[PDB]
């Protein structure tokens, strides 16, 4: 039953390890491609400090970089940003489906415009076109309630899915992780200063990069989908429609109905329903206890450039990976011509 919260945490840790193990060498290629395309010194990484003694010194080899692989990526990004696309709801063959579609795609537009939908979509497309994997999030915020669209930064090292899901949209997934970095000051601002900070370990980055800031703490959000028994109450007040079935969350006393326009009728049918829970965890325990979110699916939306399923492993590709070798051979050719020419002028 796993009554204690401590018993529930090592299961989450084991699931994290099981999800991290298979998709480890693909995200490495994604991060390497993004770094090779964007970081100014990222095309020579892996041999940054290289040279010879050269008469009792350590002069290093000249390493010139002429970036020529970003032009087509920029063209694709501009092509997308010139013609942005969004969600549209189509009507059906009913007397009142048109008004329903209009209301739905007006509400969706209102949610998209008054939130970070555009930034999230742009970031997801940029990540998908550069490395091969992008993602964004669909949350709910209290403003009295609202649906919000949020961006996810560094998807290749933050989003990990159940390894049993094989579809493009990960519909057949039972759990997922969403990691993000944090500062000690903000860690103390929320939660509590009493317990020291313990962060998740991935050993993913620092692969050919100089690290100076030890003021980052890694926290993850954990999602579960469960099938639970819920009792539905059928208020069958004949006035203004009779058949109306509601779940046990809203009660005549919790919600100020007071049987003014509701008859108790039948309230014993119990049915199993699909529910989703969210939690915040770290390397030590629970920062926030699990709570259920208002929906049925995992709210993570992945974006891929090109995706295939080859040998029990999902493999992705962007627009930079296929041209790494010719570019870093061209750079070496240029450097080896330059120094040789500078050796003997006349």
């Amino acid at each position: 039953m796993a009554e204690t919260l401590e018993k529930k945490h090592e299961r989450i840790m084991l699931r994290f390890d099981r999800a991290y193990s298979p998709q480890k060498e693909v995200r490495e290629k994604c991060i390497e491609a993004t770094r090779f395309a964007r970081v100014p010194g990222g095309q020579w990484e892996g041999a940054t400090a290289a040279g010879t003694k050269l008469d009792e010194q350590f002069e290093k080899y000249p390493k010139f970089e002429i970036n020529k692989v970003a032009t087509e990526l920029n063209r694709i990004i501009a092509e997308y940003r010139n013609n942005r696309i969004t969600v549209k709801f189509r009507p059906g063959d009913r007397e009142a489906s048109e008004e329903l579609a209009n209301k739905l795609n007006g509400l969706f537009r209102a949610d998209y415009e008054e939130t970070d939908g555009g930034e999230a979509c742009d970031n997801a497309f940029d990540d998908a076109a550069t490395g091969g994997f992008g993602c964004f999030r669909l949350t709910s915020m209290l403003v009295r309630q609202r649906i919000a669209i949020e961006p996810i930064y560094d998807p290749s090292r933050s989003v990990w899915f159940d390894p049993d899901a094989k579809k493009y949209d990960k519909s057949d997934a039972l759990w997922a992780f969403c990691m993000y970095s944090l500062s000690p000051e903000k860690y103390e601002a929320e939660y509590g200063k009493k317990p020291p900070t313990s962060l998740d370990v991935t050993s993913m980055t620092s692969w050919e990069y100089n690290w100076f800031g030890a003021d980052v703490i890694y926290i993850a959000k954990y999602y579960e989908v469960r099938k639970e028994s819920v009792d539905v109450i059928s208020y069958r007040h004949p006035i203004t429609g009779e058949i109306a079935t509601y779940d046990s969350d809203q009660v005549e006393d919790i919600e100020d109905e007071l049987a003014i326009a509701g008859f108790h009728e039948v309230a014993r049918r119990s049915v199993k329903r699909r529910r989703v829970y969210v939690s915040v965890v770290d390397g030590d325990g629970f920062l926030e206890k699990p709570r259920r979110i208002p929906g049925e699916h995992i709210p993570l939306i992945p974006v891929y450039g090109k995706r295939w399923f080859i040998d029990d492993i999902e493999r992705v590709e962007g627009h930079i990976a296929k041209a790494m070798d010719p570019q870093r051979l061209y750079n070496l050719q240029v450097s080896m011509l330059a120094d040789t020419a500078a050796q003997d002028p006349g």
């Binding site: 694709i76 092509e79 997308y80 969600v87 709910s140 949209d169 929906g295 049925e296 709210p299 891929y304």
Partner: protein, 35 residues
């Protein structure tokens, strides 16, 4: 850039499905009653 845009569209379809599933619990169910 065609394949990237097609994948973006098919991801937006899933996003719209998730939003539609999620919105019933936040904004309530819709009923066609005016007469």
């Amino acid at each position: 850039s065609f394949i990237y845009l097609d994948n973006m569209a098919k991801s937006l379809k899933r996003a719209g499905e998730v939003w539609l599933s999620m919105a019933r619990e936040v904004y309530g169910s819709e009923r066609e009653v005016r007469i």
